[PDB]
Amino acid sequence: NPLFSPYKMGKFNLSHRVVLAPMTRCRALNNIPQAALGEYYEQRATAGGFLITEGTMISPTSAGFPHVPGIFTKEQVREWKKIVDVVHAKGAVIFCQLWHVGRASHEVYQPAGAAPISSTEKPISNRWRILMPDGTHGIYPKPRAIGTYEISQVVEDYRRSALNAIEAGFDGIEIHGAHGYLIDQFLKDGINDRTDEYGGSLANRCKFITQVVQAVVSAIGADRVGVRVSPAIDHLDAMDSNPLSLGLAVVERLNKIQLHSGSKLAYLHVTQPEYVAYGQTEAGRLRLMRTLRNAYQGTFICSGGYTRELGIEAVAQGDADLVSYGRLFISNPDLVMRIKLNAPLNKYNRKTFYTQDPVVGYTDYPFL
Amino acid sequence: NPLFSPYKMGKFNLSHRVVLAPMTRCRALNNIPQAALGEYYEQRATAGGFLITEGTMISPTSAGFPHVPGIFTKEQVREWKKIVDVVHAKGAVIFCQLWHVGRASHEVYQPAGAAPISSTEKPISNRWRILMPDGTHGIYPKPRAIGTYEISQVVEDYRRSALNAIEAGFDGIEIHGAHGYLIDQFLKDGINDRTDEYGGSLANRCKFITQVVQAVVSAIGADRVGVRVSPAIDHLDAMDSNPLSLGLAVVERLNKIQLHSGSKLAYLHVTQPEYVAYGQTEAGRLGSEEEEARLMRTLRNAYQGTFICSGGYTRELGIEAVAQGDADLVSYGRLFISNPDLVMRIKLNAPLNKYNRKTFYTQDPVVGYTDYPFL
Ligand SMILES: Cc1cc2nc3c(=O)[nH]c(=O)nc-3n(C[C@H](O)[C@H](O)[C@H](O)COP(=O)(O)O)c2cc1C
Ligand SMILES: Cc1cc2nc3c(=O)[nH]c(=O)nc-3n(C[C@H](O)[C@H](O)[C@H](O)COP(=O)(O)O)c2cc1C
């Protein structure tokens, strides 16, 4: 089983290729990592396995879900350290994903009820819903388009949070630049209508992610930075007129950061749409992952719809070096050992993805 | 087995609940029903079974796939007549689906290379593609928003086409009001941005489908008219802000049409929404749990008459739908492509042939069309 062949991810010696994908779970009450997170990541940790945390706030403005952890305060750092220590005692490697939602927030999640910040003043459409703190669903408001200087302060929030993640003991960080959140609000020409130097051209639209990655590379080293994008996922109205060309532009800039710095990023991580969908429609079904992998010099993590079989095929055929798993890792704490043994996998319950119970739907999925 | 209890679809006594879902197959070269269509439908016909044809053009502007049949000319009527004959000879009931694609077309499919027509001037976005005549995937262009007063001319196209269909011997017609096509482009508030009497309110957005159904009911009789909608479908950018309320508003208008005509429609046919697409994201499923759970039954319970569910059904799922009361009839698409004798295979609980998507829309009169094997 090629999923259980070792992989050197820069300095990190992984014993298998099964990765915990980053998953918001909303158990970090009051934006403070709670003991339950320690239990949850401990359950999924394996010797030489790679974990990526749920998306984690870089600033007071970065949240658009309830009870999601931050790492922008010393208080947050201290509680994360207890979690990281427990993961490290099992021999796991763990990265903190740094998450700014940009316009995918709501006044209830913002200081002083200020407008969420974004590349644009355009709101997510009423297609989509935000999870409100009462468990109801709400409507995304109009964001405020941030100015040129402000963009550098947000870059600084990523830099300082990466330092905070090293202070907590994390092995590294991941830049959440996917799924229509703040970085993707700059990348996607369906969102970014700026007419300053961050908008228009492909090169301009990649400035923001290039600045973020470069700042965190300078702070903690490239080999402790992974970068996650999703050029073909249009979640939260995040469409690009040309996903292949946007993805290649990002890849070229990541390669260039590596060449300029003289170092290798931990990895590029790309989420794919589930192409099994729309099979029942007339035109719904009428190369990309692998083109991006081919163009990228370094470690590639694929994600989105993967199964044991699909993961095995991805590694064996060289589409990816590592395979991250989300929903199946929610319901299978011992996912790695089940994949190793080909044991049947527990079903997952969407209803408790985002609830606050520290046990139910969180740590009470059974082991083999 | 509840799938094989009989059912009175109004005028038509059916011997079982397994229905051939309408499926575009692009074998009707140059929009003429071909002899291949006769063999294909005859293969799937059973005594007392119901078939719905592939979407069929109502006018020169109504197509957005290659080699789909029309029924807007008497030459087409003559050729359909022969296909209907061989289906009737096997004791099946067959409806012709009247399909206008609206903006889901391309200049190559339009007379004189003109713009496709729609409720709006907004094109389907770049995330969707059209099948070109050569089998490449092309870009949906900018449509022309039809005038307030030309809407009645398209309504007339449905009327004349419905009369042609029954003239060919069809037991009736189904209005394709689903999947982002012309009717749905008036229905869905993600598409219909009109400022006239056909846009804005929910009432206004239902005007087009109401007038289409009332014209065909008036021409051919209510019990020969089926109506297909898909309030909750991700296809060709056909989003509505409130799918359950859109669906209920449409049902209400059909109930009203039935009360005024004094007779029930043949059925309401509803495509089940799918929820695979965004299950992998952070927020993609968030406003949709209640719709997944209950949209289909709620529409069914609201409608005075026969309900056909469609979308993802299997033998087990189809049995449950009927046993549970969620549907009266269950339509199958892709399993019917690959199993000419699907009804018998479902009856006997036999193995089912796999379907090959690569030959769904090719022009071959045999390969991937009539050469799937019987038991
Ligand atoms: C409940 C849930 C929470 C998620 N939270 C995040 C997140 O915080 N950051 C992120 O980049 N992706 C997030 N994702 C996407 C996953 O990291 C991953 O790409 C996806 O689950 C992989 O597809 P799979 O579930 O089929 O394995 C989340 C997905 C789910 C289902
Ligand atoms: C190749 C193909 C062609 C289709 N053409 C039509 C059509 O012309 N009219 C329509 O209303 N639905 C059409 N559909 C949707 C089907 O009628 C039906 O709703 C769907 O196939 C049911 O799901 P199933 O395939 O899982 O049984 C088509 C589906 C496919 C796969």
Numbering used by the authors:
A (entry chain A): 10 to 295, 303 to 384
B (entry chain B): 10 to 384
Sentences copied from the publication:
Jasmonates are phytohormones that are pivotal in mediating plant responses to various biotic and abiotic stresses and regulating plant growth. The first crystal structure of OPR3 from tomato (SlOPR3) showed that the enzyme crystallized as a self-inhibitory dimer in which the L6 loop, a critical loop involved in substrate recognition and coenzyme binding, from each protomer intrudes into the active site cavity of the other protomer. Based on these observations, it was postulated that the formation of the self-inhibitory homodimer represents a mechanism for regulating OPR3 activity and, thereby, jasmonic acid biosynthesis.
The wild-type self-inhibitory and R283E homodimer differ mainly in their L6 conformations. The sulfate binding site of both homodimers superimposes well, but no sulfate ion is bound in the R283E-dimer structure, corroborating that the sulfate-mediated interactions are not required for dimer formation. The dimer interface in R283E seems less stable than that in the wild type because loop L6 of one protomer in R283E is highly flexible, as evidenced by the quality of the electron density map. So, substituting R283 for glutamic acid seems to destabilize loop L6 and thus the dimer. A precise comparison of the dimers suggests that the amino acid substitution disrupts interactions that stabilize the stretched conformation of L6. In the wild-type homodimer, R283 is involved in intramolecular salt bridges that—together with other salt bridges—seem to maintain the stretched conformation of both loops in the dimer (top). These R283-mediated salt bridges are missing in R283E. Instead, E283 forms a salt bridge with R343 in one protomer, which is located at the enzyme's active site entrance, thereby destabilizing the whole loop L6, as evidenced by missing electron density for large parts of the loop (bottom). However, in the second protomer, the stretched conformation of L6 is maintained, as a salt bridge between R294 and E301 and a strong H-bond between Y284 and E300 compensate for the missing R283-mediated salt bridge; E283 is not resolved in this protomer due to disorder. Considering both the DLS and crystallographic data, it seems that the amino acid substitution R283E increases the flexibility of loop L6 in the corresponding variant, impeding proper dimer formation.
